[PDB]
C-alpha cells in the first residue's frame, strides 16, 4: 500500500542522491569552494534538484509524475499514498515548464543555478559562492542569449519558476521527515543524512 | 549530519 | 515589552495593507482580472510585498530593519520579542539588494512581478494571469535595458531574490499566524483575515 | 475568507 510506494520512492531518490552528488562536483567552480561551504550547499538544495528532474521526466507526460522512468504516478495512485497534495504541486511546476518547452539542457543549468542560489544558513565564503552562481547565472543567460534570441527575456521566465521549486522542495522535505518520524518505511543512510540536515 | 556527503566530495 | 512592540508592528502591518491594496488596484491589468483571481494573488503575495517595503526602508541603516519611517529594530530588541531569526532572514535580503544597490522604482515593479507570479491554487483565468505576469516581467526587462544597459544580466540578478523572498514571506506568515494563536496580540480585522487566508 | 479585501477592493 502506501509503505512499499514510499519505501521505492524513497529508494529510489537515495540512487538519484549518488549521482547528483557526483553530477556537482563537475559543475565548474563548485570544487574550488570550501568543503563545509559545498555541503551546505548540496544540503540546502538536494531536494529542489531532484524535484527538477522529475519535472524534466514529466513533461511527455500529462497529469503524471515521472519519478523514475520506470516509476510513474497518476493523481489516484498518489492520493492511496499520500502524496496527492506534493503531486499537485509538483503538477503545477510541470504546467510551467511544459509550457515554456524547458530543454534538457537548461534543466541541468537551472541544476547548477539553484545550487548556488540556495540562500544557505552557514556558507563560510560569502563571495566565492555568489562568484559562482554569477557565473552559473551568466551561463545560462549565455546560452538563451545564442540558443534563442528570439524570445528576449526566456532566462527571466525560467528564473521566474524558481520561488516555486524552492516552496514546493521544501514542502517535499517536510513530508517525507514526516514519513521518517513515523518509522514504518525503511531509508538509506545517505537520503536520511540530506532529510535530517 | 554530513558524514557520507563529506566522503563523497572527498574522494 | 514584547506585547506593545508586536502590537505596534501589526497594527503597521494592518495600515500598510491599505495601501498596498490601493496600489495594486493601479497596477495595469491587474483589475482586468476578476475579483476572485485579484483576491487569490494578493492573499498568496501580501507577505512579499510588505517584506520588499521593509527591505526597501532598510536600506539606509546597518543591521537595522526599518519597519516604518519612525520604527526601527536592531538585533537586541528583535530578540527581546521573539522576533530574531525573522529579523537575520530580513536582513539577508537587505544584503543582496544593498549590493546591487536596488532602487526605488525596481522595488515597485518588483513588489507587481512578485504579485503576479504568486502561484495561488485557486485561479479562475489561468491565462489572464499569465499574460499580467508576462507583462509586468517585460516592464522590468525594458527599465533594466534602458537604465542599467551596461549590466546585462542585472535583471536576472534582481529575480534570483524571489525564492529567498517567498521562502521569509512564508516563515513571517508562520510566525505571526502562531502570534495570532496566543492570543495575547491584539490584531486588526484586515490582517487577521490576510494572516488566516486560503 | 475575503469580506474586507473584498469591500476594499470594490
Ligand atoms: C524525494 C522523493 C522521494 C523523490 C524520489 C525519487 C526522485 O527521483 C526524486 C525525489 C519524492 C519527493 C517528492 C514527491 O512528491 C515524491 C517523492
Ligand atoms: C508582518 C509584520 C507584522 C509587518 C509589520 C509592518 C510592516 O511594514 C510589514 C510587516 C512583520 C513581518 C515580519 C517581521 O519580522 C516583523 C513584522
Not at chain 1, 561551504?37 to 513533461?59: K, T
Not at chain 1, 548556488?116 to 563571495?127: F, K, T
Given at each position: 500500500?502506501?509503505?512499499?510506494?514510499?519505501?521505492?520512492?524513497?529508494?529510489?531518490?537515495?540512487?538519484?542522491?549518488?549521482?547528483?552528488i557526483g553530477?556537482?562536483?563537475?559543475?565548474?567552480?563548485?570544487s574550488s569552494?570550501?568543503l563545509?561551504?559545498?555541503?551546505?550547499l548540496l544540503?540546502?538544495?538536494?531536494?529542489?534538484?531532484?524535484?527538477?528532474?522529475?519535472?524534466?521526466?514529466?513533461?511527455?507526460?500529462?497529469?503524471?509524475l515521472?519519478?523514475?522512468?520506470?516509476?510513474?504516478m497518476?493523481?489516484?495512485?498518489?492520493?492511496?499514498?499520500?502524496?496527492?497534495?506534493?503531486?499537485?504541486?509538483?503538477?503545477?511546476?510541470?504546467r510551467?515548464?511544459?509550457?515554456?518547452?524547458?530543454?534538457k539542457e537548461?534543466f541541468?543549468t537551472?541544476?547548477?543555478?539553484?545550487?548556488?542560489?540556495?540562500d544557505?544558513?552557514?556558507?563560510?565564503?560569502?563571495?566565492?559562492?555568489?562568484?559562482?552562481q554569477?557565473?552559473?547565472?551568466?551561463?545560462?543567460?549565455?546560452?538563451?542569449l545564442?540558443?534563442?534570441?528570439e524570445?528576449?527575456?526566456?532566462?527571466?521566465?525560467?528564473?521566474?519558476?524558481?520561488?516555486?521549486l524552492?516552496?514546493?522542495?521544501?514542502?517535499?522535505?517536510?513530508?517525507?521527515?514526516?514519513?521518517?518520524?513515523?518509522?514504518?518505511?525503511?531509508?538509506?543512510?545517505?537520503?536520511?543524512?540530506?532529510?535530517?540536515? | 549530519?554530513?558524514?557520507?556527503?563529506?566522503?563523497l566530495?572527498?574522494?
Amino acid at each position: 500500500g502506501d509503505i512499499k510506494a514510499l519505501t521505492t520512492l524513497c529508494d529510489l531518490a537515495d540512487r538519484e542522491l549518488v549521482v547528483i552528488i557526483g553530477w556537482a562536483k563537475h559543475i565548474p567552480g563548485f570544487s574550488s569552494l570550501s568543503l563545509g561551504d559545498q555541503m551546505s550547499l548540496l544540503q540546502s538544495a538536494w531536494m529542489e534538484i531532484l524535484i527538477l528532474g522529475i519535472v524534466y521526466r514529466s513533461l511527455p507526460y500529462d497529469d503524471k509524475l515521472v519519478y523514475a522512468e520506470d516509476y510513474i504516478m497518476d493523481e489516484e495512485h498518489s492520493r492511496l499514498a499520500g502524496l496527492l497534495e506534493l503531486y499537485r504541486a509538483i503538477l503545477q511546476l510541470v504546467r510551467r515548464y511544459k509550457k515554456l518547452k524547458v530543454e534538457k539542457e537548461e534543466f541541468v543549468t537551472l541544476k547548477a543555478l539553484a545550487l548556488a542560489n540556495s540562500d544557505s544558513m552557514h556558507i563560510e565564503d560569502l563571495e566565492a559562492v555568489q562568484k559562482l552562481q554569477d557565473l552559473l547565472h551568466e551561463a545560462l543567460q549565455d546560452y538563451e542569449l545564442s540558443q534563442h534570441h528570439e524570445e528576449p527575456w526566456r532566462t527571466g521566465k525560467l528564473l521566474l519558476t524558481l520561488p516555486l521549486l524552492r516552496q514546493t522542495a521544501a514542502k517535499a522535505v517536510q513530508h517525507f521527515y514526516s514519513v521518517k518520524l513515523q518509522g514504518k518505511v525503511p531509508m538509506h543512510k545517505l537520503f536520511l543524512e540530506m532529510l535530517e540536515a | 549530519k554530513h558524514k557520507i556527503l563529506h566522503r563523497l566530495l572527498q574522494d
